Amino acid sequence: MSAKDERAREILRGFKLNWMNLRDAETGKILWQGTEDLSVPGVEHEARVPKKILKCKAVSRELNFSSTEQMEKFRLEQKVYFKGQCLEEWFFEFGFVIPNSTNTWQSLIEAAPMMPASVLTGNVIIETKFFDDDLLVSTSRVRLFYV
Ligand SMILES: C/C=C(/C)CC/C=C(\C)CCC=C(C)C
């Protein structure tokens, strides 16, 4: 048990994702909402998303998170897994987080082009890794269903 393992566990304990939503970047139309904290590790989260998001060239994501702990360089690494095979990897940087602050984090996700929704549905896991700089804070997973 190292000082960094301890710091990582202090940030996670102080961390909470309050709400999240996806809109078609193009129209700004709201595709998916939810207030379930999908960043919580150790449990497989589920999300039923409209299969039209696969057609979106870009989707605008809003993350609303609270953090008791100060973070130097808060960033995300998200790997798109199809049947255990990584097809994509996104990188997002928020940067400095003020201790005991609530923050809205707007990220624009750019499209791959895609296998049809019917093939992908329930076979896609989004593996989100939660970093402060190069310190891994948490690893969480969400299984996607396209409806
Ligand atoms: C199929 C491609 C997409 C654009 C879906 C995006 C899904 C998410 C953003 C859920 C991941 C959860 C978080 C903790 C951010």
Numbering used by the authors: 1 to 113, 117 to 150
Paper text:
RAS is a major anticancer drug target which requires membrane localization to activate downstream signal transduction. Phosphodiesterase 6δ (PDE6D) has a beta-sandwich immunoglobulin fold which contains a hydrophobic pocket capable of binding to the farnesyl group. PDE6D binds to and sequesters the lipid of cytoplasmic RAS and has been proposed to deliver GTPase to recycling endosomes, which is followed by release mediated by the small G-protein Arf-like 2 (ARL2), allowing RAS to be trafficked back to the plasma membrane. The resultant lipid modification increases the affinity of RAS proteins toward membranes, where it is required for signal transduction.
Within their HVR sequences, both HRAS and NRAS contain a cysteine residue in the −5 position relative to the modified C-terminal cysteine. We were successfully able to cocrystallize PDE6D with C-terminally modified peptides of both HRAS and NRAS. In the crystal structure of the NRAS HVR bound to PDE6D, the electron density for only the farnesyl can be interpreted. This is most likely due to the flexibility of the peptide, whose composition, including a proline in the −1 and glycine in the −3 position relative to the lipidated cysteine, could provide unique conformational restraints compared to the other RAS isoforms. As NRAS has a cysteine in the −5 position, analogously to HRAS, it is likely that the cysteine would be in a similar conformation. We therefore hypothesized that these cysteine residues could be targeted to irreversibly attach an inhibitor to both HRAS and NRAS, generating RAS isoform-specific PDE6D stabilizers.
